[PDB]
Design a protein around this ligand. Structure first.
Ligand code: CHL
Ligand code: CHL
Ligand code: CHL
Ligand code: CLA
Ligand code: CLA
Ligand code: CLA
Ligand code: CLA
Ligand code: CLA
Ligand SMILES: CC(/C=C/C=C(C)/C=C/[C@@]12O[C@]1(C)C[C@@H](O)CC2(C)C)=C\C=C\C=C(C)\C=C\C=C(C)\C=C\[C@@]12O[C@]1(C)C[C@@H](O)CC2(C)C
Ligand SMILES: CC(/C=C/C=C(C)/C=C/[C@@]12O[C@]1(C)C[C@@H](O)CC2(C)C)=C\C=C\C=C(C)\C=C\C=C(C)\C=C\[C@@]12O[C@]1(C)C[C@@H](O)CC2(C)C
Lengths: 227, 230, 213
């Protein structure tokens, strides 16, 4: 009885509202294999949660530091004063080691549900992990999981899906116009007709490559825009 | 039921925890064959025991004798016994020791008797764990000691390989390299001196000389797989 | 049931999926006769195994050339090795055919009369040359680690892996030859050019592969 993505369209058999934010949308039928549907559901949570942090970071960073131009914020010379011109090789080493640990733990949970709940060092500590992708426990200090969990999952995925669309709008707008999200919004308001996608779509403002501390990094736009 | 290398995984069938240090790690299934595992069991102990002695030696050499580089100790050392005099004693002595150990691996209990002296003999034992004269003193339970031996041994095997690649890349000793890391931890990692991306590849330069002149002959000294370095 | 090279086309009758890497690809019915199929199964493995050694050797030496260690290109190594080391080519060629002839004749008469080479005639060896299957010698000489004597399920998995990497290597060795003829540069020299400008540097623009271009 739930509303579907389009009017008068039959939902797939395997989509029966069990998961949150289920509109019965699967034109490519990628969820037919039950095991594949679980894996894709996790990746939807990862993209949804990472994307929401991405959108929040870009917007908040723009307000505090308007001139950083987040697209270029990755360059070492643009880093804050404490970290300015830090050796990117050492900086990457922290991320690889720390993310490899965290992500393998999450991966092992998917392979064998409930195996990696307990802390490895300090015996006794554990997380409830009521459902895969929702560890809870220490990950939910405020205890919002208690109550109408189903509704909260719906709110999370719906906002997360919107963030995914919104963030890729930031990327394409930066590539085409060369301005951040808020800056582009101001430009449209000033001259709604002269300054819009109909004009900017044909230009890609990203240089072909950059030199990061002597290492050349290729760059591209998402379409063959006029460099 | 027992701690595993990857918690939550299922150990392979051929691994059941009987041997010391058996944490169920065998992704390629090299130990599936019973006879192959018996041989591989011996080599792991021998490799680990050599590595532990070697790693301890290199550290002690640097502390006691900082000037000499353990990598160059081969040519730096001078003794009256000469190059080929040392090698001759080493070959014959090692040939005897290794063959006897090898014979026990094939047919256990046949080389326990002392050849020269009749009265002395090695008590019954397991392959790879000789007893009697070799083990005058035992701090505690053997089962616990065997696990301690392999875990330290496995770490030592990695440690020695760390010395070689650090020595070849940084051209320094183990402790000297560590002091460099502590000085500038961010700018000294392997990530901070090498990187490969589509279109460019930067690798550290091999700091060991290509060739070594030692008593009228030239000894090649190649960096290990220098062409595949990151 | 099992996947095939051309989805929707029933596999041939003589290909029942028992062999490793079987996708029912035999459009010309070259292996319809059961006895001829045994010969080609082993011919494919020998071709695949040599190609893997060839491809790995060509790739590794090419990396040595690009990095500047001084290795010659695979298409010049033969001339360089002979001249630099002062080797008589006809003697080296003859030695190869004695060693290959002895080793490969033994493989020939094991195919004709399986188990015949394990009779102790050759230096008293009686079990290292018995053979496990067609094209899979086994034994403690050709399989010292006993990966074919351990788990049965995983050994069948490796047979699938061996043939597919062998077929991939065979295609690659054809690529090395075709690329050299069209371009006249080394394998990784071509790879570097493509990564520079993939759009404007490839076979469609080399001026050879597509003459009408
Ligand atoms: C969510 C992650 C993330 C995202 C979306 C971006 C996005 C961006 N960064 Mg940023 N970065 C990110 C993480 C990081 N960046 C940096 C460091 C930098 C620098 C130094 C620079 C950027 C730049 C860029 C731009 C790259 C444009 C492009 O075509 O790149 C994609 C180009 C590629 C060649 C990679 C495409 C494939 C894929 C993304 C990488 C996958 C690699 C595999 C893991 C390798 C595996 C190897 C095998 C053998 C095991 C863009 C704004 C550039 C910029 O500002 O330009 C104006 C720039 O110079 N970033 C670090 C290190 C702390 C990150 C760590 O996570
Ligand atoms: C575990 C054994 C062992 C190891 C790992 C090393 C390692 C090293 N030695 Mg040392 N040595 C070893 C034993 C010995 N070395 C020497 C004498 C020297 C000298 C004089 C020199 C080195 C040098 C070196 C370095 C460069 C090696 C190289 O590129 O060789 C390239 C490869 C070769 C030269 C030949 C490789 C031989 C092969 C691996 C084994 C051959 C087995 C025999 C045929 C079997 C018969 C012998 C008996 C004993 C079993 C490296 C740190 C050099 C150095 O200081 O560089 C900076 C150097 O000049 N070593 C002696 C005294 C005879 C040894 C006795 O055991
Ligand atoms: C009547 C003569 C006669 C003929 C024509 C053959 C022919 C053959 N026999 Mg032979 N045999 C013969 C008599 C006998 N054979 C055997 C026992 C065997 C056995 C057990 C085997 C053969 C095999 C073979 C084949 C080897 C193919 C090859 O490429 O070899 C290449 C030849 C060589 C590698 C050796 C010759 C090399 C060179 C001409 C001499 C070099 C000498 C120098 C000292 C080299 C030193 C180099 C060092 C220092 C680096 C070949 C069809 C083999 C085969 O294929 O079986 C299926 C095999 O396994 N024969 C006995 C003993 C009962 C014989 C008695 O008369
Ligand atoms: C995926 C998440 C994400 C990522 C990858 C980034 C990445 C970046 N942010 Mg952003 N940011 C994010 C989310 C993210 N942010 C969010 C959610 C917010 C809102 C709270 C912000 C608010 C923000 C500000 C206000 C600023 C950045 C800045 C930066 C830069 C790193 C500064 C630094 O050295 O920190 C060092 C970090 C640490 C030492 C670790 C801190 C860890 C605790 C938990 C915090 C870099 C471009 C700075 C920038 O643009 O510099 C030019 C900057 O001023 N971010
Ligand atoms: C069938 C669609 C189609 C195709 C195949 C092309 C092809 C091309 N366009 Mg054109 N273009 C189109 C439609 C299309 N265009 C439309 C509808 C517009 C008005 C928005 C433009 C505006 C435009 C500009 C301003 C420029 C090009 C240029 C180009 C070249 C590629 C480089 C570039 O920057 O493209 C960018 C073009 C796009 C990303 C348009 C994608 C259109 C998709 C495929 C169709 C669906 C669009 C959809 C209805 C939404 C429209 C906008 C929306 C706000 C309503 C290439 C010859 C460049 C050129 O002339 O180089 C010499 C150039 O500068 N196009
Ligand atoms: C794998 C073992 C190994 C090897 C091959 C070497 C090799 C070397 N060491 Mg090192 N060393 C080692 C372990 C090793 N060491 C250990 C474990 C220690 C700590 C105790 C040391 C402490 C040490 C010092 C302090 C010095 C060296 C030095 C040397 C060099 C000259 C040796 C010499 O002149 O001996 C001459 C030989 C003798 C005077 C008689 C030695 C008799 C020994 C003690 C008999 C041991 C027998 C016993 C059964 C062995 C069990 C272990 C074994 C199976 C691994 C040479 C490169 C010297 C150097 O740096 O030169 C540049 C140096 O000064 N080593
Ligand atoms: C004494 C002669 C000699 C010399 C000067 C070289 C020199 C070289 N070899 Mg070669 N090599 C040799 C003998 C030699 N090799 C022998 C006898 C073998 C068979 C065991 C090999 C097997 C071999 C491999 C597999 C590789 C090299 C590679 C290299 C290059 C980098 C150094 C390295 O990793 O070596 C490693 C050498 C050894 C571990 C054995 C040294 C024996 C003395 C360098 C041009 C590497 C390279 O860059 O290839 C493109 C590489 O991948 N060599
Ligand atoms: C059947 C495959 C095959 C063939 C025909 C060759 C042929 C050759 N290789 Mg290559 N090679 C191969 C596979 C092969 N390789 C593989 C699988 C690897 C490891 C990935 C290598 C690694 C390698 C290296 C590192 C070197 C060669 C070199 C050579 C040349 C001299 C060989 C020699 O003197 O051996 C004599 C060896 C022995 C008697 C011991 C075995 C020659 C053109 C050398 C070269 O090109 O020098 C200029 C050289 O340095 N090869
Ligand atoms: C993860 C993500 C973004 C992450 C961004 C991050 C971390 C950004 C970080 C930083 O920016 C900061 C904060 C500050 C900057 O200074 C630095 C960087 C580092 C740049 C986006 C995902 C974005 C993901 C997107 C847009 C995915 C869209 C998927 C769609 C539409 C799929 C549709 C369908 O597949 C279904 C569902 C079913 C099928 O039947 C039919 C079809 C149609 C195939
Ligand atoms: C591509 C190939 C074969 C392809 C066969 C195909 C598609 C057959 C297709 C079909 O038949 C089927 C299946 C079924 C039929 O119903 C239909 C058709 C369509 C008829 C073989 C390559 C086979 C390739 C081989 C064996 C390559 C070996 C290479 C070696 C040994 C190289 C050695 C060296 O390179 C080093 C290492 C260093 C250098 O310096 C020196 C040298 C000597 C050059």
């Amino acid at each position: 009885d739930r509303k579907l993505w389009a009017p008068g369209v039959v939902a797939p058999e395997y989509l029966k509202g069990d998961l949150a934010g289920d509109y019965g949308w699967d034109p490519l039928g990628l969820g037919a294999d039950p095991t594949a549907l679980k894996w894709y559901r996790q990746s939807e949570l990862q993209h949804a949660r990472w994307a929401m942090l991405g959108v929040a970071g870009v917007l908040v960073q723009e307000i505090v530091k308007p001139d950083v131009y987040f697209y270029e914020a990755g360059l070492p010379q643009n880093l804050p004063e404490p970290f300015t011109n830090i050796n990117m090789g050492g900086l990457l080493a922290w991320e690889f080691i720390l993310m490899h640990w965290v992500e393998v733990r999450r991966w092992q949970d998917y392979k064998n549900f409930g195996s990696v709940n307990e802390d490895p060092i300090f015996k006794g500590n554990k997380v409830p992990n009521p459902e895969m992708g929702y560890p809870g426990g220490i990950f939910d200090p405020f205890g919002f999981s208690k109550g109408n969990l189903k509704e909260l999952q719906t709110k999370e995925i719906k906002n997360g899906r919107l963030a995914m669309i919104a963030y890729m709008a930031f990327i394409l707008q930066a590539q085409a116009t060369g301005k951040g999200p808020l800056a582009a919004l101001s430009a449209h308001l000033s001259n709604p007709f002269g300054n819009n996608i109909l004009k900017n779509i044909g230009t890609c403002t990203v240089p072909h490559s950059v030199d990061v501390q002597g290492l050349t990094i290729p760059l591209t736009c998402l379409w063959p825009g006029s460099q | 039921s027992r701690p595993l290398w990857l918690p939550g995984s299922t150990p392979p069938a051929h691994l059941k925890g009987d041997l010391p240090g058996d944490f169920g790690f065998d992704p390629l299934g090299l130990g599936a064959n019973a006879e192959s595992l018996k041989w591989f069991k011996e080599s792991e102990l021998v490799h680990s025991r050599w590595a532990m002695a070697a790693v301890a030696g290199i550290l002690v050499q640097e502390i006691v004798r900082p000037d000499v580089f353990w990598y160059n100790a081969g040519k730096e050392v001078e003794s009256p016994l000469g190059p080929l005099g040392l090698l001759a004693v080493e070959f014959f002595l090692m040939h005897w020791v290794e063959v006897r150990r090898w014979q026990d691996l094939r047919k256990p209990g046949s080389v326990d008797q002392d050849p020269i002296f009749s009265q002395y003999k090695l008590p019954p034992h397991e392959v790879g764990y000789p007893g009697g004269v070799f083990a005058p003193f035992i701090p505690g339970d053997l089962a616990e000691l065997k696990v301690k031996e392999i875990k330290n041994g496995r770490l030592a095997m990695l440690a020695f390989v760390g010395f070689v690649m650090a020595a070849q890349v940084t051209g320094k000793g183990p402790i000297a390299a560590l002091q460099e890391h502590l000085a500038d931890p961010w700018g000294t990692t392997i990530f901070s001196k090498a990187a490969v991306v589509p279109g460019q590849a930067v690798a550290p330069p091999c700091k060991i000389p290509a060739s070594v002149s030692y008593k009228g002959i030239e000894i090649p000294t190649p960096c290990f797989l220098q062409g595949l370095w990151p | 049931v099992r996947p095939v090279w051309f989805p929707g086309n029933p596999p041939p009758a003589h290909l029942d999926g028992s062999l490793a890497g079987d996708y029912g690809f035999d459009p010309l019915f070259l292996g319809q006769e059961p006895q001829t199929l045994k010969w080609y199964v082993q011919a494919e493995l020998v071709h695949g195994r040599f190609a893997m050694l060839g491809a790995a050797g060509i790739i590794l030496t090419s990396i040595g050339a690009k990095v500047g260690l001084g290795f010659p290109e695979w298409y010049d190594a033969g001339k360089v090795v002979v001249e630099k080391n002062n080797i008589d080519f006809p003697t080296l060629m003859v030695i190869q055919f004695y060693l290959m002839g002895w080793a490969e004749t033994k493989r020939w008469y094991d195919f004709k009369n399986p188990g015949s080479q394990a009779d102790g005639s050759f230096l008293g060896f009686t079990e290292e040359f018995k053979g496990l299957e067609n094209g899979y010698p086994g034994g403690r000489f050709f399989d010292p680690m006993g990966l074919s004597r351990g788990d049965a399920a995983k050994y069948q998995e490796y047979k699938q892996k061996e043939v597919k990497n062998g077929r991939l290597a065979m295609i690659a060795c054809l690529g090395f030859a075709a690329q050299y003829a069209a371009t006249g540069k080394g394998p990784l020299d071509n790879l570097a050019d493509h990564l520079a400008d993939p759009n404007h540097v490839n076979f469609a623009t080399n001026g050879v592969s597509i003459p009408i271009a």
